[PDB]
Amino acid sequence: MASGVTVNDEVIKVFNDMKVRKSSTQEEIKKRKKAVLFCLSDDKRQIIVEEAKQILVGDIGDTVEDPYTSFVKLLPLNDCRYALYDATYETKESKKEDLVFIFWAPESAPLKSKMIYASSKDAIKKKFTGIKHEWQVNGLDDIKDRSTLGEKLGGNVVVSLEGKPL
Amino acid sequence: MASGVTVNDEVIKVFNDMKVRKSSTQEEIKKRKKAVLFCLSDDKRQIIVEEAKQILVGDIGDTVEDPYTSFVKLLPLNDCRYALYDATYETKESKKEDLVFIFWAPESAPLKSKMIYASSKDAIKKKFTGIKHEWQVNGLDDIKDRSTLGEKLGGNVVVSLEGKPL
Amino acid sequence: DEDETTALVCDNGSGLVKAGFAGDDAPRAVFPSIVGRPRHQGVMVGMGQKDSYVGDEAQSKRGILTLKYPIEHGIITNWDDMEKIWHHTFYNELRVAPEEHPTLLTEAPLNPKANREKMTQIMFETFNVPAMYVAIQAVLSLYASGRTTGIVLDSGDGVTHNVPIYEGYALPHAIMRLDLAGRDLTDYLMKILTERGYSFVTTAEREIVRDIKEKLCYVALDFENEMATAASSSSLEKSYELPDGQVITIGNERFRCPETLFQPSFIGMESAGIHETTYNSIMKCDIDIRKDLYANNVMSGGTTMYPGIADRMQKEITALAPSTMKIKIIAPPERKYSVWIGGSILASLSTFQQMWITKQEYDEAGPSIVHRKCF
Amino acid sequence: DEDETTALVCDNGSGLVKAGFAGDDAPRAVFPSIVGRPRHQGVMVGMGQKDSYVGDEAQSKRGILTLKYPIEHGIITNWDDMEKIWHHTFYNELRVAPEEHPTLLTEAPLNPKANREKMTQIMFETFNVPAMYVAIQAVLSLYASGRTTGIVLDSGDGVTHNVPIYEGYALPHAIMRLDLAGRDLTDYLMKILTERGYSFVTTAEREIVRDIKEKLCYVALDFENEMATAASSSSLEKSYELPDGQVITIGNERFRCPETLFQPSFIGMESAGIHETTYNSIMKCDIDIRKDLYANNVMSGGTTMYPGIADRMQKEITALAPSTMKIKIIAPPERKYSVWIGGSILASLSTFQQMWITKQEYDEAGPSIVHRKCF
Amino acid sequence: LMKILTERGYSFVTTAEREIVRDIKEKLCYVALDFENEMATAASSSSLEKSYELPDGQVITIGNERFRCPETLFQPSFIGMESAGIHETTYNSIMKCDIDIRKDLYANNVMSGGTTMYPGIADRMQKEITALAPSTMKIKIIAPPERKYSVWIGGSILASLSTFQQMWITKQEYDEAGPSIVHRKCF
C-alpha cells in the first residue's frame, strides 16, 4: 500500500517516561535513563523497542561515563534504527535540556531497511510531541560525537554538553 | 599573400556624422548622414568612401523622395559595394533613429568582386560599431520596394519608416 | 537660458532604463539595465575587441557571461557598471554626448538619498553636463493621472513597490517594496513552460518568452475558478509562431505569470501579494489619510499592463479594506511609460531657469547642492 | 488465508522504462522509451499482431520504422504510443493480466497533475488494475540512499534533473533540469571515435558505442592531469572486441567524453554544468536547510554509474561552495535502478490504505482521487 | 552506378571502366523532381534507353540508371543505410542552429561540390525542403555555374590578395608561434 508503517504504543509509553525531568528525590536517581533505541518489527507493520544500553543517571554515580557515551557502543552497524535522546546542554548563561529525534541509517545497511525506516520516521516524528531538534545520521562518527550534536542544537549555545566542553 | 583587404579610419570620418547626433533645431538638419556609399579601391587593398551622393536631412525637402530611393539611382546593377544608413522609423512604443550597415552584392555580380568585398564584412563591421541592423542587399529588386527597408531591420516596426506609412 | 536645446530624459524605473529627448511623449531607447560579466572564460573574452558587454549586445553572447544588472533591486551593486549602462544609453542608444544638452534623471526605487549624489557626479564629471535634475518616479505617474494624492504601485523588470503620496509629498514610513521582479517572472514563465515539455533554455529564447509575457498573459478574475474552468475551457490555449515558423501554444501559464503578483507563494517567496502590500502600505499611514489613499490606488510600471489587473485589484482590495470605505483603482492608458512621459513633460516647461543644478554651481558647491533643488 | 498480492512495479523513468514485480529486487524488463510505427520503405515483415514495435523490438529493427518517444524528459510527451509501452510490458514482458495485480507507476520531476489523472484513468480504463499508486521518482532515489532530507538527481540518456527535498517533500522553486545528457555523451563518443578513424554508422553500431560508454568510460579527477598521464603513458589506452572478434582501442576518449558534462562549452551548450546546476539548485533553496543539502548530495541515475564522478563532484562542489561548509556527496552501490528498487520496496510495503488508490475510490471520486491521495 | 549497370550484364571492374562510369556520372546522370513522374515520362517516351560509346569504338547502353543512381542521396535507405537525405540533413542542421538565426538559413542554402552537377538537384532540394519547413517561411537554394570548383575559386581570389597586415602566418612568425599560429593570427 506504499503508506509507511506505524508505532506500537510501547514507544509512546517510554517517551512519556523520558520526556519530563522527574522527581529529584528518587526518579532522577535510578528510574531516569535518557536514551532509547527502536526497531521495525519482522512482520514489518510496526515500530517497536530494541536493545541498546538505556543507562540511568545514577549509573554515572556507580561506575560509568554519561549514558550517551555508553549507549553508542550498541548501535547496529548494518541496520537502520531510530534512537531518542534527552540532550542536556550547558551554555554561556544557563543550562537547557532538549529532546532529539535521531534517525540512524548506516551506509552499509540494506536498501529495504533504509526505505521503510525513512518513510515511517515521519509517522513517529509526528507522535513524539516534545522533540525540538532532529538529525539523520549515517557514519558512526556522525552519531557518536557530542560536538557535532551541539551543532544540531546550534544557535549561539556553545560552552558544554553532558558536562563535556563543546 | 593569401590575406583579405584591411579597412583604415578614413571610413570613421564619414561615420562620425552617424555615430553621434547634434541639436535637432539646426545641426541634425545639416549633419545627420542618412546614406553614404563605400567601395574597394582598385589598388586592391582597402575599402574607401565613394563620394557619390552623401545624403543628409536637408536634401529630403529639395528632391530626395526617400534618402535610399535617390541612392538606388546610383548603386551598380552587377557589382558589389558597402553602404551605411541612419534609419528613421516610428514604432508602437518608441521613435527609433538607428544606424544600419548595408552589404550590396547583386546575385549576378562577379565572384572575383564578391569574394574580396564579402570577406571584408568582418573588417568593416568591427569599425562601424554602434549599428543595430544589417541589410543584406541581393540586387535592386530586393530594395526598390520601400517596405523591405523595414523587414531587413526585423520587420517588427509596424507603424512608419522614413516619413512613409509602415 | 531660453535657447532651443532639448534636454535628455533618462528614466531608470525598476530595472528598465528608458531614454530620449524632452518635449516628445515617446522615447528613443527602452532596454533592461543588463551587463554580461564573464562566467569562467574571462581570459578568452579579454583578448577580444572589448572585455565587457552591456544591454541587448550582452544578451547576444551565449553561456560565457553571467548576465546581471548594476541597479538590480532598486539599489546599485556596482557604480562603474551603472556608468557603463548610462554611457551606453547616451553615447550608443540615444547617440548623444550629455555635454551638448542638459539631462533629467529619476531617483531609483527606495534608494538612500546619497545614491543620487553619485548620479550628480557621473553627469558633471564623466559626461561633462551643463545642467541636471533628479525627480521621484512615482510623483510623475501620479501627476499624469491628475491627482496630487494617491498610492502608486510600480511593477518593473527590476522589482515592485507601493509608494503612498499625499499632496505631492511621498510618505516615507509607508513605502513598501515587494521583492517580486517582473524580470524573473520570466524565470518562472520558462519553468512553467518546461512543465509543458518545451526545451526553451537559451538567452535568446528568454526574450521570446518576454514577448509571450507582454503578448499572451492576462490576470484571471479568480484563480481557483479559472483553474476549474481551464479543465473544460479548450479556448484557454493561445498559439505563438516562433521566429523560424514553428507553431507552439501557451494556456494556463498565461494566467499563472500574473497570478504570481497575488500569490508570491507560487514562485516560492515569503512576501504578501500586491493587494496585501497595497493594504499594508495604507495601514502604516495616519488614521485620517487612509480614506483618500483607498480611493486613489494608481497602477503603474510594466507588469500592470496585464488585462484583468485593475479589475482584480478592485476585487481583492475591497476584501481587506472595510466595505464602509470607497475603494477605487485607477489604471492609466500609458502606465508602462508614465514616469518617462512625465519626465519629458517636466523637462519641457519654462517657469524658472536655474531650477536645474548647473555645472557652475557644482564646481564650487559639490553634489549635495542636489538636495537644495531635487525633492 | 494469508498471502499478499505481489504488485507490478513499472518505473516510467527518464525515458528508460523499468518493469518488474514488487519485493523481487531485480527488474524483469528494462528498455528505452522508443515505439516504432512502420515505414513502407525497405522490407517490413509483420509477423506479430500489432503495428507498434516497442523498446527492444525497435532496437532489433533498424531503418524500417518511424520512431516516436512517448516519454523523453520524464514527462509523457505522447499518450497513444505510451499505452503500448504498458500493454507490451504487462502482456509480453511481465507475462500477466493486471486484473488481479496492483500497479505502482512513477511520476518524474516537473510532471503536470493532469498527467496523474490520465495515468490513474488508463490503469482503470485500458488495463483493468484493481488498485494503483503514483510514486515520485526522486523521493524513491533519495530513500534508496536512506535520507528523508537532501538533494538528489537522476542523470540518464534522457535528461539530468536536480531535486532538493525536505522530509520526503520536494522543494519546487529550486528543481532544475540540464538537458545535456547521456544521449549527447554517446553520440559525442561516436564523434571522437570517427575522428580517430573507427567506423560506427548504424544504430546497431551506435549501441556498441553506448556499451563502450557504460563499460569503459569514467570521469577524470581533473582533465589536464589525466590527459598528461594518458599522453606520457599510451599503454593506458585499452582494447575492445566487437561481438565477432573485430578489435578496436580507446583511451583518452574515455574521460574526454564524460568531461563535457562538467564543461558545457566543449559540446556547444549555453547552460550550467552538473556541478554549477547542483550548486544553483541548492542555492535557490531556503537559507537554513542548504547545509543539510550540502551534506546529503545523493548521486543516482544511469549516467552516475561512471567511476570518478562522486570524487570529482566533491572537488567541484568544494570549489563553488564557501570553505566553512561540510560537503558530503553519496554515490551508492547501484544507481541506475535506485528509483525502481525504492519503488519495489515501497510497492511491497503492505498495510494502511492511505497512498494506494483502490478502484472503488476512482468510481466514487473520479480521476481527482490521485490529488486526495498522492501527497 | 556500376552496381545497377550490373542489371544489364556489364561486368565492369577495372579503372579503365571506372573512367567510362565517371563519364556517364558527369555527362548522363540527373536527379528526378518526382521519381514516379520521371519513370512514367520515360515509359511513355519512344526513347529512354540510349547508347554511350567508349574511346576505342565499343558501345554501352544506359536507361533509367541515370536517375536511379542520384536518388539514393535524397534517401540513403535505397543503398541501405539508416541515414536521412541531404535535404533532411540540411534542415536537421538548420534546426540544431540557434532560434534567432534559423530564419535566414532557409533563404541561403549554397550548393557547392562535384555531385551538384546533376540536373534537377537544386530544383528538387527546394521542392523537398518546402515539405520539411513550416510553409509560412520561404526557402531559397543557390547552385552557381562553376559549382564544381566554387570553394577553390573563392580560394584563388583570396590567394591573390596581398594585404597581409593583419595575418602574419609566415616562416619568421611560425618559429615563435609554432604549429598553433593559425589560432593566434586571426580575431
Provide, for chain D, the percentages of residues in helix, strand and coil under a 3-state DSSP scheme, each rounded to the nearest 5: 40, 20, 40
D345/A111 Cβ within 8 A: yes
Spatial strand order of the sheet with D53-54 comes to D53-54, D35-38, D65-68
Q: Among C28, C49, C101, whose Cβ lies nearest the Cβ of B95?
A: C28
Instruction: Provide the sign of the torsion angle of the four alpha carbons D202, D203, D206, D207, taken in this order.
Output: negative
Task: State how far Cα C134 lies from the chain centre.
Answer: 16
The answer to whether the CB of C14 falls within 8 A of the CB of C154 is yes
Domain that holds residue C214: 183-261
Residues of D within 8 A of E83 (CB-CB) are 201
A3/D349 Cβ within 8 A: yes
Residues of C within 8 A of E98 (CB-CB) are 62, 202, 204
Chains B and D make contact, 3+ CB pairs within 8 Å = no
E144/B2 Cβ within 8 A: no
Residues 69-98 of E with CB under 8 A from D: 75, 77, 80-83
The answer to whether the CB of D175 falls within 8 A of the CB of D285 is no
Residues of D within 8 A of C62 (CB-CB) are 270
Closest chain B residue by Cα to residue E100? B154
Alpha helices by DSSP H, chain B: 11-14, 16-19, 28-31, 67-71, 111-118, 121-127, 148-151
Report the alpha-carbon distance of residue A20 to residue D176 in Å, rounded: 45
Chosen for mutation from E82, E88, E96, E99 (greatest number of chain D CBs closer than 10 Å) is: E82
- Mapped onto helix, strand or coil, the DSSP state of residue B53 is strand
The answer to whether the CB of D302 falls within 8 A of the CB of D210 is no
Exposed (0-12), middle (13-18) or buried (19+): which is D337, by Cβ within 10 Å? Answer: buried
B94/C97 Cβ within 8 A: no
Distance between E89 CA and the closest CA of chain D, angstroms: 15
C49/B20 Cβ within 8 A: no
B126/C28 Cβ within 8 A: no
Chains A and C make contact, 3+ CB pairs within 8 Å = no
Domain that holds residue A81: 1-166
Residues of E within 8 A of D41 (CB-CB) are 75, 77
Report the alpha-carbon distance of residue C24 to residue D343 in Å, rounded: 66
Report the alpha-carbon distance of residue C298 to residue C170 in Å, rounded: 14
Report the alpha-carbon distance of residue C353 to residue C1 in Å, rounded: 7
Distances (CA, A) of B53 to B28, B38, B72: 18, 11, 11
Chosen for mutation from A41, A119, A145, A151 (greatest number of chain D CBs closer than 10 Å) is: A119
* Sequence-separated (6 or more) residues with CB below 8 Å from residue C83: C122, C126
Report the alpha-carbon distance of residue B99 to residue B69 in Å, rounded: 17
All three cell numbers of C347:
523637462
At position A82, the amino acid (one-letter code) is Y
What is the number of other CB atoms lying within 10 angstroms of the CB of residue E29?
A: 19
Supply the Cα-derived Rg of chain E in whole angstroms: 22
For cell 557626479, name the residue. Answer: C121
Report the alpha-carbon distance of residue B151 to residue B162 in Å, rounded: 13
Residues of E within 8 A of C246 (CB-CB) are 134
Closest chain E residue by Cα to residue C244? E103
If phi > 0 it is left, if psi is from -120 to 50 it is alpha, else beta; for residue D117 that is: alpha
The answer to whether the CB of A19 falls within 8 A of the CB of A97 is no
The residues facing B165 across adjacent strands are B160
Distance between E100 CA and the closest CA of chain C, angstroms: 7
The answer to whether the CB of D18 falls within 8 A of the CB of D337 is yes
The answer to whether the CB of D9 falls within 8 A of the CB of D344 is yes
Q: For residues C186, C188, C193 and C198, what is the CA-based torsion angle, rounded to 10 degrees? A: 80
DSSP D97: -
Tell me, what CATH number does E45's domain have?
A: 3.90.640.10
Distances (CA, A) of D364 to C205, D367, D369: 44, 9, 9
Residues of E within 8 A of D201 (CB-CB) are 81-83
Q: For residues B64, B67, B69 and B70, what is the CA-based torsion angle, rounded to 10 degrees? A: 60
The answer to whether the CB of D269 falls within 8 A of the CB of D180 is yes
- Go through chain D and tell me how many residues it has: 375
Q: For residues A23, A29, A35 and A39, what is the CA-based torsion angle, rounded to 10 degrees? A: -90
Output the CA angle E145-E73-E19, nearest 5 degrees: 70
Exposed (0-12), middle (13-18) or buried (19+): which is D356, by Cβ within 10 Å? Answer: buried
All three cell numbers of D29:
524488463
Report the alpha-carbon distance of residue C362 to residue C370 in Å, rounded: 9
The answer to whether the CB of D194 falls within 8 A of the CB of D201 is no
At position D72, the amino acid (one-letter code) is E
Supply the Cα-derived Rg of chain C in whole angstroms: 22
DSSP A33: B
- Go through chain B and tell me how many residues it has: 166
The residues facing D36 across adjacent strands are D53, D67
The answer to whether the CB of E79 falls within 8 A of the CB of E72 is yes
All three cell numbers of E119:
540536373
The answer to whether the CB of C299 falls within 8 A of the CB of C156 is no
* Sequence-separated (6 or more) residues with CB below 8 Å from residue D188: D257, D260, D267
Q: Among A3, A111, A118, whose Cβ lies nearest the Cβ of D354?
A: A3
The answer to whether the CB of C17 falls within 8 A of the CB of C11 is yes
Count chain B–chain E contacts defined by CB atoms under 8 A.
47
Instruction: Provide the sign of the torsion angle of the four alpha carbons B121, B124, B126, B132, taken in this order.
Output: negative
Alpha helices by DSSP H, chain C: 42-45, 56-59, 79-88, 115-124, 137-145, 185-194, 203-216, 223-230, 253-259, 274-282, 290-293, 309-320, 338-346, 359-365
B93/C30 Cβ within 8 A: yes
If phi > 0 it is left, if psi is from -120 to 50 it is alpha, else beta; for residue C95 that is: left
Instruction: Give chain B's domain count.
Output: 1
Residues of C within 8 A of E136 (CB-CB) are 241, 245
Report the alpha-carbon distance of residue C193 to residue C196 in Å, rounded: 5
Report the alpha-carbon distance of residue C139 to residue E5 in Å, rounded: 87
Identify the CA nearest to C21 among candidates C119, C94, C129, C126: C94
Identify the CA nearest to D358 among candidates D123, D185, D74: D123
Q: Among C205, C244, C247, whose Cβ lies nearest the Cβ of E102?
A: C244
E134/C246 Cβ within 8 A: yes
All three cell numbers of B162:
522614413
Report the alpha-carbon distance of residue B33 to residue B30 in Å, rounded: 8
* Sequence-separated (6 or more) residues with CB below 8 Å from residue D145: A114, D152, D298, D300, D330, D332, D338
Distance between E98 CA and the closest CA of chain D, angstroms: 11
- Going by DSSP bridges, is the β-strand pair A46-49/A81-90 parallel, antiparallel, or unpaired? unpaired
All three cell numbers of C149:
494624492
What is the number of other CB atoms lying within 10 angstroms of the CB of residue D289?
A: 20
Closest chain E residue by Cα to residue D63? E82
The answer to whether the CB of A133 falls within 8 A of the CB of A103 is no
Distances (CA, A) of C30 to C75, C345, D327: 19, 18, 45
Phi, psi of B150 (to 5 degrees): -100, -40
DSSP C99: T
For cell 546533376, name the residue. Answer: E118
C239 touches chain D (CB under 8 A): no
Chains A and D make contact, 3+ CB pairs within 8 Å = yes
DSSP C91: I
Distances (CA, A) of D198 to D168, D192, D194, D205: 47, 9, 5, 11
Query: What distance, in Å, lies between the first and last C-alpha atoms of chain B?
Result: 48
Exposed (0-12), middle (13-18) or buried (19+): which is D209, by Cβ within 10 Å? Answer: buried
All three cell numbers of C53:
558587454
Distances (CA, A) of D99 to C189, D12, D22, D24, D81: 42, 20, 16, 20, 21
